[PDB]
Amino acid sequence: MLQFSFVSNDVVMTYDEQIIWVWESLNKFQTVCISRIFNFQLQDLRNPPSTVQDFNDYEYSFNFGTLNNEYITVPGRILSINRDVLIHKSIKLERKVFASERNVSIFGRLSKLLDHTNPIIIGGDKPEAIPKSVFQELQSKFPNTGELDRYANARVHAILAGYLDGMKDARERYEHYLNRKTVIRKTDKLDLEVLNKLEIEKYTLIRDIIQDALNNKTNLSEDDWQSLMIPFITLLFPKYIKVLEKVKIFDYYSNPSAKTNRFIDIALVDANGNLDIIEVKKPFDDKILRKTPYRDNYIPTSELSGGIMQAEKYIFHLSKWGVKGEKELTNAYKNSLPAGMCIRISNPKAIIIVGRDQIANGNMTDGQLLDFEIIKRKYANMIDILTYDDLLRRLNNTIEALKG
Amino acid sequence: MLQFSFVSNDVVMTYDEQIIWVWESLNKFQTVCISRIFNFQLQDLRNPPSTVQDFNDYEYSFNFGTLNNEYITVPGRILSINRDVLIHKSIKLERKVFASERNVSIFGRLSKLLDHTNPIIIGGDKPEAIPKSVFQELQSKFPNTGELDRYANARVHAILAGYLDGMKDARERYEHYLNRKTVIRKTDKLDLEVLNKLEIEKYTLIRDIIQDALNNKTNLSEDDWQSLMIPFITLLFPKYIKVLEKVKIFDYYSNPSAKTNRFIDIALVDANGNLDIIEVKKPFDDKILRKTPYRDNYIPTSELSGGIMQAEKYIFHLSKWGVKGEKELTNAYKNSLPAGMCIRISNPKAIIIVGRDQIANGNMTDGQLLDFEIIKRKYANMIDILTYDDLLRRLNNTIEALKG
Amino acid sequence: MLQFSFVSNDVVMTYDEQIIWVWESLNKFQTVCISRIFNFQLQDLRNPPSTVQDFNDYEYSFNFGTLNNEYITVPGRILSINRDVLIHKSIKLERKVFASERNVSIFGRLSKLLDHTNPIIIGGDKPEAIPKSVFQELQSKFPNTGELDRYANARVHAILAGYLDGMKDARERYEHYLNRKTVIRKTDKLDLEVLNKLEIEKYTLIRDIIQDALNNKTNLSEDDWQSLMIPFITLLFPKYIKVLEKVKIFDYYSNPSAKTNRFIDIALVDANGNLDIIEVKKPFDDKILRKTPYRDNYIPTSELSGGIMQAEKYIFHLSKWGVKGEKELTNAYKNSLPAGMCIRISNPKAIIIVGRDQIANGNMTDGQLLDFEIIKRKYANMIDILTYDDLLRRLNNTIEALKG
Amino acid sequence: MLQFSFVSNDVVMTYDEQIIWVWESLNKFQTVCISRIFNFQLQDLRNPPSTVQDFNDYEYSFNFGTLNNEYITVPGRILSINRDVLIHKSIKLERKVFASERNVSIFGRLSKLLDHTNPIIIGGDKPEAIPKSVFQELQSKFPNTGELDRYANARVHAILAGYLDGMKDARERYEHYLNRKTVIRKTDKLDLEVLNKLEIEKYTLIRDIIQDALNNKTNLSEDDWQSLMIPFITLLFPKYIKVLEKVKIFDYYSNPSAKTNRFIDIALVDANGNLDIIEVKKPFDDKILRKTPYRDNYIPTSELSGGIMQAEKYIFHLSKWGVKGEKELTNAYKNSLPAGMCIRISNPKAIIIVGRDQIANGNMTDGQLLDFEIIKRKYANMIDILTYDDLLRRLNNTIEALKG
Ligand SMILES: [Mg+2]
Ligand SMILES: [Mg+2]
Incomplete structure (x- = not known):
């Protein structure tokens, strides 16, 4: 049992059944551990028990450092910490304040965390002091029985x-x-504002270049457009880490007698190593929709349908290639891929960028807008169907979200 | 010093200071407690030590149960357990099997968990039996006093x-x-090469913080852990421009008479305005894959199945909510969303980051690795299934691709 | 321009320069096509034209029909049909009643359709007379210029x-x-009731045999259970025409150095040659759910998870095998398959029949029911997940629909 | 009889009951009509018939068109249509090109169809140009008096x-x-072999009736065609227990201010109750793929795209309706559905039977056949895409499998 009392300048704790070990260890090491949180020297013991007196019969009395300035001062050596600790008179000195459940040294953990050597103060008029109410809240938060x-x-x-x-x-x-329990404090967070500003600077630059290309560049060929958008694809789609060009694949459907080579102009490799196909096509006023609805339903134009068919064929040829295809593609692009990464077909999907939406023009009526959204989600393999105006709108939304 | 032997298909535990007190306690209370894990009735003691017999040369013998059908059957009373305890014959009986570290009753904690009174079975082909390898893992990972x-x-x-x-x-x-970032961006003007170098720094920063959070912030509450990763979720998944917390959805299936409001802890909004769900789960469990394959095929852990089920239930409610949900969510988060973007619930999907695969250890076999990849792709509404180790590997792959 | 008038109680047709040609054609052949719908002869001419008389001045006179008992009777030869045509006096006589638009012979078409040789009757009190109202409705139905x-x-x-x-x-x-304009009569649709009764007989026979096995034949081993269900599998799922057993599948992921043979116990071939996997598992009370929910969400049981994983592995191996797999499977099962059918792996999907719902014997809570439905529609590859009790309920629904 | 020659890059047509009367008609009407397809003004005549020249000795020469830009441009006045007609140079000019059987102008009908004033273009690589092979198909299938x-x-x-x-x-x-059925089932006791024979008879009966409807009664209204196949829809797809006609659904996307009622012509309810949609389109074309491939890829025809779009719009409205839809649909069809079964919108899927592939002909090339299959499986929210010929082939496959 530990009883804590203060007499005049010094504060003395009393250890109250076999205390023979304490005396022996105190002599052996000039130090004993009481409750695993108190380290007392033979000098610290107010009176050493006589060898003739039974140690169990004797009541042990260990002395803490002298209290002063209305604050109890406790030696660092007793808590085995570099910085001494100051305890206010208002808190009643007890073992619960010194140690948490499982004999955890509350002061010892606090000392390791505090890089500064300044002595710990609790509930004190001194500026560098722990608010007493908050200190009690920390005690409640500490793990307890159950x-x-x-x-x-x-x-x-x-x-x-x-x-x-x-x-x-x-x-x-x-x-x-x-x-x-909420360990973290909401006020103490990471602003990350400079990182967000750089992301806006990256998104604005990509949006400005693509918008300028639509506005003034029509002379460049479809292949030239593919080349212009190839660097942006990795940044627009961070999930795809690598871009592959002229990916040869093998055909066992178009000609039964002999395999036919097929070349994907632009392919995308996921961080997982999954393979996806991206189709970049020349922007046009209406390359995404027709002019007249069929039977009161707007339908995809030949241009868009042909682009979907091209990507669908490549996905079908890859699905047939299967495991053998992954090994062939891996060996061909192993240097391009990060080390420890292999291309896996993993059900390939296609990203399509065809034409410019008339929603920005306002030509499309609400019924056309409904059909336009449905054409976008009509094909499972074409996970995302995008138009250059739609891509700019997506970039604008991302920039606005970062701005806010 | 306890020795366990089987005589006539009946298990006997033999114990070998003064042991006279053990006989006195056995007579006084009609029971004795030895090692703090075993309680033996006076009738249970195999041999009564007579007063004339020398206790120093006598070793106590107690029935430890009966070996039946190749299963050792320790009585529940011995471990003070309401349900029976069964061990396989191949598993050697030891004090370590019943007690871990400083006299901690291993069976006691398991009994408190089991509301049902059905007997605990360890080893063998019994359907309810716990595999010996899993039991060895339970011994090592048991919450001992240390x-x-x-x-x-x-x-x-x-x-x-x-x-x-x-x-x-x-x-x-x-x-x-x-x-x-300052060293890389010497000039305010941004180049594609400069952007790639800035991206490498951003990805390294996100990866370093996540690894630090796994190493020291694991003991934090699930709510606190989600708060740490919530800013990173937008950066890890740029497609999703905005992150929404505590989104409220309506459930009519659970109670037809009165709708019950359910809360999605984290929800992701893409640039399109479509709504998706993200689950960030504290990695309390070390393994995302069950230690033993059910039938030569590795199966998802309860933690993985629970995260998938909770997200699937949310997706189910969102699809059921339909147009009414889109209008209600858009009005609630109109200020949060960039202007001109409306929350649309179309094809809602979920991304789950739960537990650690630990493929770094190399414990996983080629078949186990194949099963883990299939489980990641097995679920339809989980576009990405991730583990904290898997997320770090994906970040490393992105950094390497940007470098090359 | 033809005019019909009654002279001597008989109809007269007047024809209004082709008049000379019509006289020449009358000399060449007795039959002359007037308006392409009327055949007329020299005998029918009331007043035959002559070369000396001016053809333009002359007006053609013909005997169209003889009116008997106040009912016009028209000869078969004029309409080139075997049976005569009767016209009621009240019904107007003109080219339109005789012929539809584009000179289509209404009476000629009707005569071919009518198996009976009884003369066509339009109007009058005759038993088989066509009512004037109905005849006018038929004329409106006949195609117009528009x-x-x-x-x-x-x-x-x-x-x-x-x-x-x-x-x-x-x-x-x-x-x-x-x-x-609907020309069909609601009465004409086939009752098809006798066929529907036969379908009820087939469904009841399948339902009863499955029911008898569940309640009484628990003795059969899982292989014995699958054998009993294989004939019913085609009837339960008619889309899959053929059942393949012990289908050898090449596996490369499990052991890269050497291919391994995986044997799909039961496989299903669609009419299009698409390949599907069916897993028949021994029924047990529950076995589709765990007794205790994980974090308030019921999770799939280990037995169910293992069964889904085994089917997923077979689907994964088939996708990797790809086109090479389709050729190998076609060669192995060409004899079993109908000629002109080739096994196409395409996107393999699996149908799983495992356990019993447990809902009928003991009511499940609404949350358990919601989780059970969610688990069935959770995995993408497992398009259909069923329990033996679910199968009986499906059979009951089909039988009730056929009855009603 | 008309001869077209290209002199000085100018197309001139020459012709040879009196030509002098045609010259007089030019003085009377300031224009003349020749062959009922060509109208030539005074300016058009290339060389005037001089009185000294024997109208007969001279051959009436009329300027027909101008050859420029490797194309033959024909003025609108010549064909009496507002829009000019352009014929490719490689295409020989013939009366057949501008006139169908019995002087039915091919271009005039096309001009009526086209709302825009843009000139009709035949042959060449221009997108607005109609391919020569398609024009040959038009000539043969063009409506004519026959x-x-x-x-x-x-x-x-x-x-x-x-x-x-x-x-x-x-x-x-x-x-x-x-x-x-009477000959096969005389035992009065159902047997698996007897059931197979009854199933073959049911499949043959459905196949023969569908084949007869293709051959005759095709001209019936689309609603009549749907009613004809409505009883067989359940037999063709036995998983679907009930068929619902004119299912009202609520549409909110088309008009924000008010909901607009949309009617699903035919809706399929399965044993589970998962509502699905089937589209029965009256065949009007023998091509389900475009006659000329878009850049070597065969796009789906307008009829196939329109039917898929209509099904997609219905599926989209059902998903938005969600739980509210399940309640309204169940209440409306509660009597129609078996008691204790409720409609669950879940994920709506569509089955479309449109047009005829004509695969039996063998006209399709191997690449065209590959494109055909890819288009059927490339559409999401569609369980399958079927043609009437494909449906008959599926019925044949089931019959052969039942036989053995
Ligand atoms: Mg969560
Ligand atoms: Mg329809």
Whole structure:
């Protein structure tokens, strides 16, 4: 048992059954550990017990550092910490303040975290002091009996969750109790404003170049347009880490007698190594939609349909190539790919950039807008269908979100 | 010093100071507790030690249960467990099997978890039996008094660190990124090569902070962990321009008479304005794959299945909400969203980052690796299934591609 | 321009320069086509023309029909039909009642359709007389100049619809005008009731045999269970025409150095040769769900997860095998398949029949029911997930629909 | 008789009951019409017939067109149409090119279809140009007095057949099936072999009736065609227990201010209750792919695209309707559905039977056949895409598999 009392200048704690070990260890090392949190020298003991007196019969009295300036001063050596600690009179000195549950040295953990050598002060009129109410809040937050039991139940539950059925939901209860506690402070966060500003600077530059190319560049060929957009594709689509050109694939459907080589003009490699196809096509007023609806339904134009068919054919040829194709593609592009990465077909999908939307023009009526959205999601293989005006709108939305 | 042997298909535990007290306690309470894990009735004791017999030369013998059908059947009363305890014959009986570290009853914690009274079975082909390898993992990863103290030391340190400096390590990494960004961007004008170098610095910064969070911020609450990754989610997934928290959806399936409001902890909005869901789960469980394959095929862990189920339930409610949901969400988040963008619930999908694959260890076999890849792609509404280790590898692949 | 008048109680047709040609044709052959709908002869001429008389001055006079009992009787030869035609006095006599637009013989078409040789009767009190109201309705149904123009516009529209892209969508106009006029009679539709009763008999026989196996034949092993279900699998799922057993599949992912053979126990071939996998598993109470929900979400049981994974592995191996797999499978099963059918892997999907819902014997909570439905529609490859109780419910629904 | 020659890059047509009268008609009307297809003004005549010249000795020469830019430009006045007609130089000018059988101008009908004043262009690489092969298909299929008369005769025959014994041919096929069913099932005890034989008879009956409808009664209204196939829809797709006609759905996207009612012509409800959509399109063309490939890729025809678009729009409205849709649909069709079964919109899918592939002809090339299959599987939200010939082939495959 530990009883804490203050007499005049010094504050003395009393250890209250076999205390023979304490005396022996105190003699052996000139230091004993009381409750794993107190380190006292033979000098610290107010009176050494006589070898003739029974150590168990003797009541041990260990002395803390002298209190002054209305603050109890406790030596660093007793807590085995470099910085000494100051405790206010208003807090009643006790073991709960010194140690948390499981004999955790609250002051010791605090000392390791604090790089400054300035002595810790609690509930003091001094500016560098812990608010007493907040210090009590930290004590409540520290793990307590039954919080450890919830963690223990959760750890065993996680190991046998599949193996054992009928086990109580220990993990859910432990997480819920932990969720009520909020270790992090919302005010102390990372602004990340400079990083966001650089992202805006990157998005604006890509948006400005593509917009300028639509406005003034029509002379350049479709292949020249592909080359212009090839650097931007990696930044517009960060999921695809590498861009591959003229990817030869093998055909076993167009000609049964002999394989026919097919060349994907632009292909995309995911960080996972999955393979996707991107089709870049010359922008036109209406290369994405027709002029007259069929049977009261707007339909995709020959240009868009042909572009979807080209990408669909390449995906179909890759799906047939399967594992053999991945090995051939991996060996051909191993240097291009980051080391430890292999191309995997993984059900290839296609990204299409055809024409410019008339929504910006305002020519498209609400019924046309509905059909335009449906044409965009009509094909599963074409995960995303985009128009150059739509791509600019997506860039504008991303820039606005970063700005806000 | 306990020795376990089987006589006539009946298990016998033999124990070998003064053991006279053990006989006195057995008579006084009709029971004795030995090692703090085993309780034996006076009837249970195999041989009564007579007073004339020398206790020093006598070794206590107690029935430890009966070996039936190749299964050792320790009585529940011995471990003070309401349900029976069964061990396989191949698993050698030891004090370590029943007690971990400082006399911690391993079976006791498992019994508290099991609401059902069905007997615990360890080893063998029994359907409810726990595999010997999993039981060995449970012994090693059991929350022993030392492990509980380690958790308490970590939790106390985390609470003090969060109050003292918040995300100090993340801020230091951000300051390093800012210095690198200034060196790379000597000129205000931006080039594609300059943008790629800035992207490498941004990706390294995000990856370094995530690794630091995994190493020291794991003990944080699930709500606190989501807050740490919420700014990074927009950067890790640029497609999703905005991140929304505590989104409210309507559930009519659970109670037809009255709708029940459900809350999505994190939701992602893309530039198109389509709504998707993201789940960031604290990696409490070390493995995202079950230790033993159910039938030569590795199966998803309960933690992975739970995260998938919770997201699927959210996606199901969003699809059911339909147009009414899009209008309600758009009005609620109109200020948050960039102007001219409306929340549309079309084809809602989910991205889940849960647990750690630890392919770095190399424990996974070629078949196990194949099963893990199939599980990542097995779920229809989870476009990306990720683990914290997998996310770090994807970040590394992006950095290498930008470098080359 | 033909005029019909009654002289001597008989109809007279007057024909209004081709008049000289008609006289020359009358000399060459007795039969002369007037308006392409009427055949007339020298005997029919009331007043035959002569060369000396001016043809232009002369007015043709013919005997059209003889009126008997106040009913006009028209000979078969004039309309070139075997049976005579009767016209009621009240019904006007003109070219339009005799012929539709484009000189289409209404009576000639009707005579071919009528198997009976009884003379066609229009109006009058005769038992088989066609009512005047009905005859006028038939005339309105017959195509007019506007419908012929609309059909002509529709025919040209379809040929160049993709090319010009500037047409007025005349197809939609023509189809809409056609839709307003329905020439079918609701009574004519086949009862098909006798066939539907036979379908109920087939469904009841399958339902009862599956039911008898569930409740009584639990003795059969899983291989024995699959064998009993294989004949029913085609009937339960008619889309899959053929059942393949022990289908050898080349596997490269499990062991890269050496290919490994995976044997799909039951495989299904679509009429188009598409390949699907069916997994028949022994039924058990529940076995589609875990007893305890994980974090308030019920998760798939280990047995269900293992079954889904095994089917997913077979689908994954087939996709990797790709076109080479299709050729190998076609060669192995060409004899079993109908001639002209080749096994095309395409996108392989799996149908899983595992466990029992447990809903009927013990009511499940609404959350359990929602999770059970979600699990079935969770995995993409598992298009259909069923329980034996679900199969009986599906059979009951089909039987009830056929009854009603 | 008309001869076209190219002198000095100018196209001139020469012709040879008196030509002098034609010259007089030019003085009377300031214009003349020749062959009923060509109208020539006074300026058009290349060389005037001098009185001294024997009108007969001179051959009436008229300037027909100007040859410029490697093209033959024909003035609109010559064809009496507002828009000019351009014929490629490689295409020989013939009366057949500008005139169908019995002087039916081919260009005049096309001019009526085209709302825009842009000139019709035939041959060449221009996108607005119509391919020569398609123009040859137009010439052969162009409506002419014979073709229109043939359509009118067939329509009149169908109207009379609808009036008397509409489904008489179908009744005869059903009677044959009933006689065959009696011969097969004499035991009165269902057997798997007996069921297979009954299934073959049911499949043959459906296949024969569908084949008869293709051959005759095709001219019937699209609504009549849907009603004809509506009983067989459940038999063709047995998973779908019930068929719903004119299913009202709520559309909010088309008009923001108010919802607009949309009717699904035919909707399919399965045993689960998952509502699906089937489109039955009356075949009007023998091509489901464009006659000329877009850049070596065969695009889907307008009819196929329009039917898919209509199904996609219905699926989109159902997904937006969500839970509200499930309630309204279930209440409206609760009596129609088996008791205890409710419509669940879930993910709507569409089945489309449109036009005829004519694969049986063998006209399609291997690349065209590959494009055909890819188009059927390239559309999301579609379970399958079917043609009437493809549906018959599927029925044949089921019959052969049942036989063995
Ligand atoms: Mg979460
Ligand atoms: Mg329709």
